[PDB]
């Protein structure tokens, strides 16, 4: 059984003009290149976004697809909490 918390958190923050953004927090920024992971997810979703301050930010609400997309990048789906 899993011996850690649901350490990759995915949640929504407000953007302007009635839009929203998806935040992915908890990917180890020391070990992995969050800029690169952001670029990959941006390309898969054709959306804007950035990596900053230890988090990835994506334009729009991508909670519907984020577990599949992070699993395409090898992340364990049990570590991912979509909030």
Stretch that binds ligand NO2, among 9-17, 29-37, 56-64, 68-76 (CB under 6 A): 9-17
Token pair listed for 15: 């953007």
Can you tell me whether residue 13 is helix, strand or coil? strand
Token pair listed for 13: 């923050």
Longest dimension (CA), the chain: 43
Stretch that binds ligand NO2, among 8-16, 34-42, 48-56, 69-77 (CB under 6 A): 8-16
Q: Using the rule CB under 6 A, is 15 a contact of ligand NO2?
A: yes
User: What is the Cα 34 distance to its own chain's centre?
Assistant: 9
Number of residues that bind ligand NO2 (CB under 6 A): 3
Residues near ligand NO2 (CB under 6 A):
14-16
């Amino acid at each position: 059984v899993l011996k850690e918390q649901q350490r990759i958190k995915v949640y929504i923050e407000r953007a302007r003009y009635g839009k929203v953004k998806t935040i992915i927090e908890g990917i180890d920024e020391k070990e992995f290149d969050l800029e690169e992971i952001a670029k990959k997810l941006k390309a898969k979703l054709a959306c804007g976004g950035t990596a900053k301050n230890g988090r990835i930010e994506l334009q729009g609400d991508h909670r519907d697809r984020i577990k599949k997309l992070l699993a395409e990048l090898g992340f364990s789906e049990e570590l991912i909490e979509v909030e």
